[PDB]
Design a protein around this ligand. Structure first.
Ligand code: NI
Length: 245
């Protein structure tokens, strides 16, 4: 099928209120099929005489990292031409109350291997950003596969985008590429967002989120588009002592 869902006022309203939103079908079945074929080539599972995914971060990797490609549109420039990109930019515009032309953007590809046992710990995406420069923005996480709690779908802290950027620390101070985490989210307050293929979740830069391990025997792929404003000077910057400069 080639049908795609729509957004309405209620979608925007709950995004503003809760800091995240579920879009049941942002990519059509045929768009998902094409994205899957693209990932088949981007993420080559390669054998040795343990298999590894033949990308930076994996083939040269301490504990395993989540297989991911920053700005995959460099390798597959067919990506940002797409109706799916345009559709997502329009959604971002509606949700941020900003003209599409004002948005900076980039792509991000993720594959969670079968039986990948590490979670993505609680974090806010803004914790990765320079406290001297504020951007409004969001992420649109489009799944290529069923996403369930057991396969590693995202969980959010509703309303957390109106709270502080929580204290974060490196998972390993001597292995910073593993990323950041916060201990300051109550898991009983979390809400999970399972998705069908072609569905997406959208979240603000400040909404805390977590992803579980992939306890299933099938890879789980997501294509993430980030849309954001130009940076604005912050007069009194937060310390964020966990920042990797
Ligand atoms: Ni994140």
């Amino acid at each position: 099928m080639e049908v795609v869902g729509t957004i309405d006022h209620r979608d925007r309203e709950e995004f503003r209120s809760r800091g995240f939103a579920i879009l049941p079908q942002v990519a059509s079945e045929s768009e998902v099929a094409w994205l899957r074929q693209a990932y088949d080539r981007l993420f080559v599972r390669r054998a040795t005489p343990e298999d590894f995914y033949d990308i930076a971060g994996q083939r040269d990797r301490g504990p395993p990292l989540l297989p991911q490609i920053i700005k995959p549109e460099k390798y597959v420039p067919e990506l940002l031409d797409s109706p799916h990109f345009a559709r997502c930019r329009s959604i971002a515009s509606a949700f941020l109350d900003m003209a599409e032309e004002e948005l900076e953007f980039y792509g991000h590809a993720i594959l969670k291997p079968p039986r990948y046992g590490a979670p993505t710990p609680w974090h806010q995406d803004e914790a990765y950003m320079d406290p001297r420069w504020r951007r409004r923005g969001l992420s649109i996480w489009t799944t290529l596969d069923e996403a369930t709690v057991e396969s590693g779908c995202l969980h959010y802290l509703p309303g957390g985008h109106r709270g502080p950027v929580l204290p974060h620390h490196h998972i390993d101070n001597d292995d910073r590429i593993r990323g950041l985490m916060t201990d300051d989210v109550d898991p009983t307050s979390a809400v999970a967002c399972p998705l069908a293929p072609g569905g997406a979740v959208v979240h603000d830069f400040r909404t805390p989120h977590y992803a579980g391990p992939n306890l299933t025997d099938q890879p789980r792929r997501a294509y993430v588009l980030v849309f954001m404003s130009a940076p604005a000077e912050v007069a009194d910057p937060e310390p964020r002592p966990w920042m990797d400069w």
